[PDB]
Design an enzyme around this catalytic site. Sequence first.
Site, short mmCIF file in Angstrom:
data_model
loop_
_atom_site.label_atom_id
_atom_site.label_comp_id
_atom_site.label_asym_id
_atom_site.label_seq_id
_atom_site.Cartn_x
_atom_site.Cartn_y
_atom_site.Cartn_z
N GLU A 185 0.83 -1.19 0.00
CA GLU A 185 0.00 0.00 0.00
C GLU A 185 0.88 1.26 0.00
OE1 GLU A 185 -3.99 0.53 0.31
OE2 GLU A 185 -2.64 1.95 -0.71
N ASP A 227 -2.40 -4.94 1.27
CA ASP A 227 -1.69 -3.79 1.86
C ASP A 227 -0.25 -4.10 2.28
OD1 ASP A 227 -3.91 -1.90 1.70
OD2 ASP A 227 -4.83 -3.16 3.27
C1 LIG Z 1 -15.83 -0.75 1.48
C2 LIG Z 1 -15.78 0.60 2.15
O1 LIG Z 1 -16.57 0.88 3.05
N1 LIG Z 1 -14.85 1.50 1.75
C3 LIG Z 1 -13.95 1.29 0.76
C4 LIG Z 1 -14.32 1.46 -0.59
C5 LIG Z 1 -13.40 1.25 -1.61
C6 LIG Z 1 -12.09 0.87 -1.28
C7 LIG Z 1 -11.70 0.73 0.06
C8 LIG Z 1 -10.32 0.26 0.38
N2 LIG Z 1 -9.37 0.23 -0.60
C9 LIG Z 1 -8.12 -0.24 -0.39
C10 LIG Z 1 -7.15 -0.20 -1.53
O2 LIG Z 1 -6.00 -0.71 -1.47
O3 LIG Z 1 -7.56 0.42 -2.53
C11 LIG Z 1 -7.80 -0.74 0.97
O4 LIG Z 1 -6.61 -1.23 1.33
C12 LIG Z 1 -8.89 -0.69 1.97
O5 LIG Z 1 -8.69 -1.09 3.13
N3 LIG Z 1 -10.07 -0.20 1.61
C13 LIG Z 1 -12.65 0.91 1.07
MN LIG Z 2 -6.63 -1.96 3.21
MN LIG Z 3 -4.84 -1.38 0.01
#
Ligand SMILES: CC(=O)Nc1cccc(-c2nc(C(=O)O)c(O)c(=O)[nH]2)c1
Ligand SMILES: [Mn+2]
Ligand SMILES: [Mn+2]
Length: 181
Positions: free
Chosen positions: A61, A89
């Site tokens: 990440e 991540d």
């Molecule tokens: C599902 C939600 O409530 N929010 C959301 C929406 C879209 C993406 C992410 C998200 N995205 C990533 C990513 O790497 O893009 C993460 O590591 C993560 O923990 N959450 C979280």
């Molecule tokens: Mn995440």
């Molecule tokens: Mn992520």
Amino acid sequence: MEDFVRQCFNPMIVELAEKAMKEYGEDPKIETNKFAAICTHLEVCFMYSDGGSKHRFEIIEGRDRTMAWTVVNSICNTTGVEKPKFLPDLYDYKENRFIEIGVTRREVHTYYLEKANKIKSEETHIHIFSFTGEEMATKADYTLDEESRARIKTRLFTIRQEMASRGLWDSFRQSERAAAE
Ligand SMILES: CC(=O)Nc1cccc(-c2nc(C(=O)O)c(O)c(=O)[nH]2)c1
Ligand SMILES: [Mn+2]
Ligand SMILES: [Mn+2]
Ligand SMILES: CC(=O)Nc1cccc(-c2nc(C(=O)O)c(O)c(=O)[nH]2)c1
């Protein structure tokens, strides 16, 4: 909220959050709740990586996508572990697994199940924190010691308070459901 985030998180994290939002064509000035969430998630990811022995974690990440894939590819081809369908991540060198870190203003188990069905992977470990002190992790295996997890929980509850004292917490908490739906 914009000014709160810029003074609550360090510039490197802010910088990385802006780039991450810009790469998706969104405006941190307008979508400030997502800006906060992104910085928070990043900050948790770095605290987590730091929680282990010096070279335990590969940080995935916070990187530009392409280079993130290259690193995942490298770990997969050198460890035998299956290639995840989505960018995780971190990678744990000690446990030989990727990790997805989640941070939620809603219930830990709800968020956990959303993550677990999106990935459809039995290898990638999932670890969710909430802004209310709880955590849920795959197989109840928390990876880090209690001390390192506790520090993260404290930091999250400090963000909640600083938000609330500024009148920003309600909108921030409510926002997640809207994002989902
Ligand atoms: C599902 C939600 O409530 N929010 C959301 C929406 C879209 C993406 C992410 C998200 N995205 C990533 C990513 O790497 O893009 C993460 O590591 C993560 O923990 N959450 C979280
Ligand atoms: Mn995440
Ligand atoms: Mn992520
Ligand atoms: C939710 C969180 O803190 N983790 C994380 C990481 C990366 C991205 C997002 C995210 N957060 C929000 C939000 O508004 O809370 C979104 O609408 C969204 O699409 N993604 C959240």
